[PDB]
Design a protein around this ligand. Structure first.
Ligand SMILES: [Ca+2]
Ligand SMILES: [Ca+2]
Ligand SMILES: [Cl-]
Ligand SMILES: [Cl-]
Lengths: 265, 265
């Protein structure tokens, strides 16, 4: 029944290859239990060195397309350090984008970039959708969390051509891809065009991507310490909302350990 | 006292020159009373032919800077035709970018693009801010009216680095340039970057423009018939709300005349 295309728990970091094709100046990930957590046997991937880029990619369990199917993207992310400026997002890439993991690059083509990103007064949850060569921003602010405990970001994409974004299981945006992005106005940014243009024609498949093949992380960090806890990708709505209560139960536990180290101070 | 840099009432259209430099097929503007109106002596600028572009520009009474200064743009716009797809908006341009009005084009550099824009399910009020050579979208949806009577779009930009948007005098958005735009991540749309990057630094003057000189209209119309009624630009908030209240009765009258024509149908 349910198909899970990916579920990383970071017991290890074996599927994840650091880019050897960026021009950086990259930092190292470490698999670390965290200063506080809901399960001592559990485990996550952490950026470990300040003011550096972090770029790594991993192949998914199976190449797939979400055409005429659901798709849920859902991963748990912790800004343990008290983030000041740094990304916590992920990208998902088609097979055609990268000949293999080490060649993943910021300029690498992605289908979707999703997740928290914090710098100064900007705290938002990306939902960038790639369409016909352009990356399109969500058009609809979705703030992201900024404290030091893990939160669960969920993206939900139905073939109805609509989406849903939840954080910690509570829906925070819902709308239809043609109404909430300007994907069908490609020259609005560069060419001073409006949304109303010729070539604005409704696309039943703004939700569809032919190929999902890699997941990738490419964040800048000034204060390192961001931790990717768990990552899940699947086509089954109940399966994703079956694994989340596990994770949010453990984040609750994580919170109670959290506040006891802050009175040890 | 109050400085009014521009107040067009469209008794005529003389100050407005149709672009001879866009590469596009233009339609003709006509000065019209409208199918319904609040004063038969007042006219507006109307797009008159389906599936054409409408591109013209006009010089303001004075070149100015809003540095250390308030600034309000407030114009009345009516989609009398029952719009399906069309702008909408206006642009404000510095004294460069165009040697004179006829050379205005969508690709011309502008300071601000503001106003309604409707196409299919996309109905929003633009507040595009030009920064660093790139046009930045407001990142926070602001819906726009889409019926067939006139509505008064008002944007005010204070040297505090904040804005607000009203429609028919009712404030519908409020915020700070550094939080509700992503102006300080110019390479996020292209380049596949995040907001958090090494070149994010706060700018107190995201509100300031060295040169305000031209105003322009360059909208696409599927169903033509949009009327630009009145345009006001000024550095004084009172006087802007003073001139607002006259225009908003004229819309009330325009409103009573309208439901009075469709009871005949
Ligand atoms: Ca885990
Ligand atoms: Ca008028
Ligand atoms: Cl986004
Ligand atoms: Cl906008």
């Amino acid at each position: 029944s349910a198909k899970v295309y990916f579920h990383e728990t970071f017991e290890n970091r074996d599927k994840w290859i650091d880019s050897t094709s960026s021009g950086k100046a990259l930092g190292p990930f470490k698999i670390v239990s965290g200063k506080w957590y809901g399960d001592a046997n559990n485990k996550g991937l952490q950026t470990s060195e300040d003011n550096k880029f972090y770029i790594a990619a991993a192949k998914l369990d199976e190449e797939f397309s979400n055409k005429d199917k659901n798709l849920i993207v859902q991963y748990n992310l912790k800004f343990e350090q008290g983030i000041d400026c740094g990304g916590g997002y992920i990208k998902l890439l088609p097979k055609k984008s990268i000949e293999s993991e080490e060649k993943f690059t910021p300029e690498s083509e992605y289908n979707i970039m999703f997740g928290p990103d914090v710098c100064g007064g900007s705290k938002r949850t990306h939902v960038i959708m790639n369409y016909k060569g352009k990356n399109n921003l969500i058009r609809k602010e979705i703030k992201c969390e900024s404290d030091d405990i893990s939160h669960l970001y969920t993206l939900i994409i139905r073939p109805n051509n609509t989406y849903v974004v939840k954080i910690d299981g509570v829906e925070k945006q819902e709308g239809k891809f043609d109404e909430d992005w300007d994907m069908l106005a490609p020259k609005e940014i560069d060419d001073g065009s409006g949304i109303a243009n010729p070539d604005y024609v409704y696309d039943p498949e703004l939700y569809k991507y032919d190929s999902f093949a890699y997941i990738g992380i490419d964040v800048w960090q000034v204060k390192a310490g961001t931790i990717y806890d768990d990552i899940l990708i699947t086509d089954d709505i109940e399966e994703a909302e079956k694994e989340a209560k596990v994770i949010l139960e453990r984040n609750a536990a994580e919170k109670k350990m959290r506040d006891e180290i802050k009175e040890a101070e």
